[model samples]
Target: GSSGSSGASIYKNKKSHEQLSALKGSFCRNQFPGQSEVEHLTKVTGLSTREVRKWFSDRRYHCRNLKGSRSGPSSG
Candidate 1:
């Protein structure tokens, strides 16, 4: 297997985070040391893709929180 800046493909299994595969649960938690982070997030998690960044652009690009709002994904 080879590692590229964005063309890397990994098949390794890592479950260090109890909230990840360890607990079948899973952000900052998304950001990693650098772009190399794309591999595991893609190959393992199936969340990454060719465009990688700006995927948010498809999910309705909007300004995130600013102050005391610090919202969670679940609000009902």
Candidate 2:
């Protein structure tokens, strides 16, 4: 029997500025857009559902991290 590696890559795929703008706009308007909305984005941007979902997830994660950090005491 051969051993298998347990590591996996999480590299982010490159997205064009236009695509990012559209996705960001939708995210700003609705942090958690519905499935129909996601489908619309997929159709319009020509991006896979996974890409759209990953973008939203990453965006939300960063937003939360920034908010949390900002709320803490300043290191002035």
Candidate 3:
């Protein structure tokens, strides 16, 4: 019988920006985290500094423009 194929390193320890953006969703608040938080987010999410900066800015503007109707409308 032939030798079986060796298993490669399949451990994918990826830093999910999904959760990184989750931080911004936690932004479901009335303020911003500012610079330090951006650095922290970069370290944790492994995202580009420039990209995260852009995201933080856009996230704020977008989140800011959002109105009360996030889900159900006028639910009784």
Q: What is the TM-score of each candidate against the true structure?
A: 0.29, 0.65, 0.42
lDDT of 3 by residue, 1-76 (tens): 7533455322323446666655675355525666677677677666676555555555555455466656646658
lDDT digits (tens) for residues 1-76 of candidate 1 = 8444564343333334432441121133442224555554455545544433323232222335434665556656
TM-score (C-alpha) between model 2 and the true structure: 0.65
What is the clash count for each candidate, in the order shown? 2, 0, 1
Give the number of the best model, judged by lDDT.
2
Residues forming the 10-long window of minimal summed lDDT in candidate 2: 2-11
User: Is 1 or 3 the stronger prediction by TM-score?
Assistant: 3
**Model 3, which residues run further than 4 Å from truth?**
1-17, 64-76
Task: Put down candidate 2 lDDT per residue, 1-76, tens digits, no spaces.
Answer: 7433355334567778888888888888887878888898897788887667667877776656455535678679
Ordered list by lDDT, greatest first: 2, 3, 1
Ranking by TM-score: 2, 3, 1
- The regions of model 1 sitting more than 4 angstroms off are 1-26, 29-33, 55-63, 69-76
How accurate locally, in lDDT, is each candidate?
Answer: 0.39, 0.74, 0.57
